[model samples]
Target: AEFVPPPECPVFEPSWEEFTDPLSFIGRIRPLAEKTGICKIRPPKDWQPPFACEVKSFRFTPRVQRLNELEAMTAFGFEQAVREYTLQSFGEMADNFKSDYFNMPVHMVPTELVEKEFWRLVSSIEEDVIVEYGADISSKDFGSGFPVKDGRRKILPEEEEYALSGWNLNNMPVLEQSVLKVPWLYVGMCFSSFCWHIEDHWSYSINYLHWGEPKTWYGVPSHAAEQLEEVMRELAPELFESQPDLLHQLVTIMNPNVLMEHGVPVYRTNQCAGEFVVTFPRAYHSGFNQGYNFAEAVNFCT
Candidate 1:
């Protein structure tokens, strides 16, 4: 559902046997990639999809935004004021996110300011403001160049023949499997953050940093899942009512510390170049980027 999380928070890394259960809180001792199947990724020097561009037809319109919770509450509003603020502020520019005016040399993108934009907008950054592209990777929509290899599972013939064949992350070859959706590509600069949310109905997710600066993340254990959401609702009741789909809304931007201050246990980590961050089922998570970066993530079942 989302390299996001749940079953509950502070996911347990059970011994392949105990992985599905997380009841206690203890600091993690990340196993060395060598002995563990953790897989320290290796994206070749010249092979990061060559800076997310097109030698072919697809180009992008850059729409920068913020996704963290910065002094929310009093800074934001409810009902009519929300709609009026949006239309009056964004107007035509809001709909024209795909315009050529937003485009610039990809390098000039000040990822640093991209970071600062959050504090300025979290309360004001209307909905879905980032220049998001390929939220779902496809061979046809964007460019399709080099092929990819997934985790430990070999690309055997006819794995697709079974009914539930695609259920396992190990079996599905991410980025190349046509029957199922592929990885999502996110290009962000500076303060671009993914607000608090859990992946689809409690499924695992995996995110890989193709290149650039790091992204910081805050996560809560699966057992504390509902508590986090309850706290979010208590804090942003107006956001809960004003949005289209109440079940899933991007209006959330609370920092994990905010949750911790409210008695929710929060854990975190930074994902850097060529690193992979895997989120277990139902673990509510959110984070912001340090600079320009390219990442791809996907959702999966057991």
Candidate 2:
């Protein structure tokens, strides 16, 4: 059987005037988008913010992931595809791995095939595909997708204002800033996935894809969160007996079709470069990258 994608969530292409203030724009779309739990916003064509990192030397040790959807370790011991957990440059490693995986140039791989194969491999018991991906906070070498002032150099007046706006994580109180107030960068290749879970303490999160391939997302509106939990519990009650931190302990990959069959409302979307996907508070969301991609996201409380 083939995997059937759920219907897409809302997508808004905001005009420059409406997108002038990020927080204000989010507030305006709050009511409607919240109903779907997640929505995509496309900024005006000219509104590109230059990537503030040196792509040539930017490096991080990616974590190894197995394509077996549910509880990867339970089935067998880990056998990482690569011999070592080596530090890798985003541009070179991402492209090389993808190019080699499909036996073609990275850009030559069709998006549709990647999508289809990702779903197929994860669901197949015979294949134990492994992928490496990166997820980390901003460091000295790399910075947030949104421009921010860090005292490294003189910031322009417009940049300063944008950085200080309430919407920017840079302006959060110092205590929280140390923990949840910074943007996180994500590096992904085909089949790299994030399991279904909600933000800690139910805070809202906004994710932006800076460049490269698209990320596919599946979301359940906050209103349907309880229904989703009940269905998962019914099917896998053993997952609920865990000690602490509900989702962190229970996170796993599951087909969206299963949730929909159990009466949980689910929506899916493909977030392309320069697009922003906002997840409402308490929403349950999960997804995988179509191919190699870079995404940055941050959680905020309003």
Candidate 3:
């Protein structure tokens, strides 16, 4: 295998034809994908995590979910859908899987069970069920949102202003000068999802899969940014009607398949460990964990 760097565009305006993947992003072909607003990066040369400490040591509030509550499972009445599915799949463990603990690190349990229990829980009974474990990773504790490397990319003045503002709102410092979204980390399981939304101020975001199973993504390109919004307003009018600022808050999580049905072109990928997913401004991206995974992401403009 060869290296596949994420694409970058000098002009920053690429046709959908240029944006489409050519089966695999091998070697030189990958540099073409960087500006697509949504593309993947293999590990950077010999990149590796600092260490895998006991995850429990970071004890903070654990975001919990009972799978069936998500709108994607609306076909099944939210609670019943989540509950019934877990019943058939979990068997004896089904009771424990339904409406249970909120704080035990899912990583503390066996990986095999975590994946199985996760899928089973999300496929049935509910809507609005999503569990995420952290929004507190900051330089004071987590260190640089991104590592300080040799000969780093220089920052522009406008980039600094936007970066600092986003961190202040997130109640953190801007870690590292990299345009990558900084100082935010998340631990997710099964169907835990990051809903459909764009970065603040339509800035770009770089997401790194720290470890675990791949995180799946569905993205609408910048070209179709408006199309996705038009579709959203039509599908969930009340959401936009009463709470106009909802989108800015990262509040809704709609299934990608649904977005595609509304004429919003959607692309899919499973972002595996050590990979980076870069979202160009206004990509309208959303995704869920395939299993247990850890990821860090931040926003910026250049």
Candidate 4:
């Protein structure tokens, strides 16, 4: 099949006239939907990207129904265990003269002590952590996260108590099942040089900023493999080293634009005390922080 890219649409800047009023924002939805397939707010003209952004606040509110005390306890235990494992595995690498961005697989490390000590350090941080399956159809590498290669089925070890506990994985129903509130803190130099890629699970995301600023992100759809490959070839020569066949698959995939059919690439800059929500299905997305400052936010999702 011939590779066809999504048609380019003219981008619009954010308008305060629409943002401050919920009705106005909603009113623009029709136009946005017609133009971008995805409805979203545009960033202000003067907005810039941040250099670093920290997740300042997060709370999981039961949307479908509240879990009983026992269920809550199970959830808490599961959270603790996962956090411990992540901290133990990732923390140890950071402590033993490792880089802040330690991007190695957990199974590669040869010793249990590294995992144990890593979790010990993570216990000191005040954040709730949990693991979810990565996308079922992407070849992206796991960076300090679980690997989901080729959309393979994920199995939770039976010995792990949480695996047996009922936690919903169905995206559609889960979308109505709960709300996740996440706060963010953006700190550091205001270089507007931050950029990262992320994929969403089966939920819509709305990010509200309480303070500081950040650049909005616009990304090509994941299926734009030809463009992505061309960019990767220029930016990361090493990616083509041992994975020549994978690289070719990326470039030759059918409907490279299909991966992002549900979502559109949008960018924002230097936001303060605002919220953005993803109401539609979302896939591969990327963005940059506008400045080097502490920014706080909350995320609502189900």
Candidate 5:
């Protein structure tokens, strides 16, 4: 497979006028909605954000893996419970807590009491944090192979390692917090209000929503993933070194055309409020979100 850059059409940007009256946009986007299996429910009208409409342009291919009956049942159960628990806790913290990525704990809080107290600290500092830092702190470079703003090697503080561990529970291993006591639990606060770039790892994911909405994703296959590597080899060699995990010598030799065709998969969906699962055998993908709200999902291996 080769990377055929999708025809260079005018980039699609969200329209304020259309979002102000979502009904109109819905009609216009009907064809795309059908093709992509995306559905949005009763979106609020006249909801405008400060930022200009961000455009998301990516390619999609068919998913190579699917869940079996047992896998589906387990996924459904975990998704349901996570949704309920996250929503309840998130609602309590929303008003009191402002968004601060570094302040959050990296490990899971073990008991309900610990979790409660943790949220209390988060809520207590909400106002002060927001007043000092403004609406949202960006996590774009946290682990993106960049130096921290303060000339530190790590962006997250040592005390907060637990929180990072807690939120990293998906297939890829993350820090486990003492408060939640669950190993491999995802700490939603870290990714609550940010957009992340694509990164490769060895794991599967099944994200469930409790509140707030985020865009969903599907990854490109190994073939396309390799094609993307080749394109980067020539166009952005530095990027190759920066993301060596995806651009290794052996990887390039095995699949010279992979990077050229690297793109998101076809079965992707934008999440309003539901379960969104992804099994990444190859390429990486990104999921974008709008605001700072709560949601819960788990990442585990098949």
Candidate 6:
């Protein structure tokens, strides 16, 4: 069997002039980029913001996950051993998992093969793979990428300027519910995946890859959301067999090829460092980490 990749998603490389105001540039591209469900943006080469934390000492509890692409099929279980780790240690562990599985150095393994194997393992009943990843709201231990005005600390001029110009959830007057406002920090390794789902409130989500390997994404336009759902319900009827309300709350996976076969358009991209991936409202999107990486994301509604 062979794998056929989906069409590449649109990528925007804005000049310093265009990148000066994030919200304005996003608005300018909404007409075209929104049609693809998701788009990537590359800021000017000199616009790199310094990573503002000490990696070696920072820590968080990672979520244990099974490789089952279908979320409802997974058997619930707690992690056998709870552990906190530094970025360097997790990077080594992730690399070793890939190297040991394929009998080669992590870098030597082809990206194409990783893509194929990810789908194969997730769909196969015999392959019971487990991975660990971090998904948490910005907390006292770890802060957001956006500048905040908490009296406890001062914001840097570089980050402060963007905070004011950019559209950030932090400024929203919603309740003190931590996750909605503070950007979520996602720490992931090879094959660690987030299943197909849309953001709550149909909000636009912008994700920035702070460092490490590329993260691969697949998306379906908002207009095709219903079509995609019907296809999933047909394929995994068991998911809908008993629960009438299951349609309202669910996350599952299906190959892009399957969606295309049934008249759904799917777009994909590999988001590298210093790049931003923005998903429009109601666009169903999912992705897997190519290798050890750290990303920060937040949702905003207009």
TM-scores for all predictions: 0.54, 0.84, 0.58, 0.32, 0.32, 0.86
Question: Candidate 2, 255: how far from true, in Å?
Answer: 1.0
Against the reference, the lDDT scores of all candidates come to 0.47, 0.74, 0.51, 0.30, 0.30, 0.77
Provide the lowest-lDDT 10-residue window in model 2.
81-90
lDDT of model 6 at position 216: 94
Judged by lDDT against the true structure, how good is candidate 4? Answer: 0.30
Candidate 5 lDDT tens digits, 1-302? 22222221111245444433323443475454433323333222332111111112111111111112112222333322212223234433432342333344323222222222322333242322221101121222122111122343334444243223212222233343348611111223322222112333443343434344343332344434445445546544353445664334322221112332354223333454333333333434333232233233333432
**Shift in Å, residue 135, candidate 1:** 5.0
Q: Per-residue lDDT for 1-302 in model 2, tens only?
A: 77777888999998867876656788899898888999999978876665554554566777677777464434245455433222345456667877888899877887667767777776677787878777644634466655677765445665665465543444433233335346778878777888778888788888889887899999999999888877766665365534344653345567788899998999989999988899998999998887778887877766
User: Which residue pairs clash within candidate 6?
Assistant: none
Ranking by lDDT: 6, 2, 3, 1, 5, 4
C-alpha RMSD between model 1 and the true structure: 11.5
- What would the TM-score be for candidate 3 when compared with the true structure? 0.58
What CA RMSD would candidate 2 show? 3.8
lDDT of 3 at 184: 64
**Leading candidate by lDDT:** 6
Measured over all alpha carbons after superposition, the RMSD of each candidate to the real structure, in angstroms, is 11.5, 3.8, 12.0, 19.2, 21.8, 3.9
Error of 2 at 96 (Å): 3.5
Residue 242 of model 5: what lDDT? 57
lDDT of 4 by residue, 1-302 (tens): 22233343334345655434333444456344433323344555543222121122211111111112212222333332212112123224223322222334433432223322323322334433221111121112121011112233343444122222111011112324537522233222221222223333423333333233333433343334244445444433353334564343332221223333423343222233333333333323333232222322222343
Question: Which regions of candidate 6 fall more than 4 Å away from where they truly are?
Answer: 54-56, 69-82, 137-140, 146-180, 239-250
Q: What is the lDDT of candidate 1?
A: 0.47
The residue-level lDDT of candidate 5 at 283 comes to: 33
Off by over 4 Å in 1: 1-58, 62-140, 144-180, 239-248
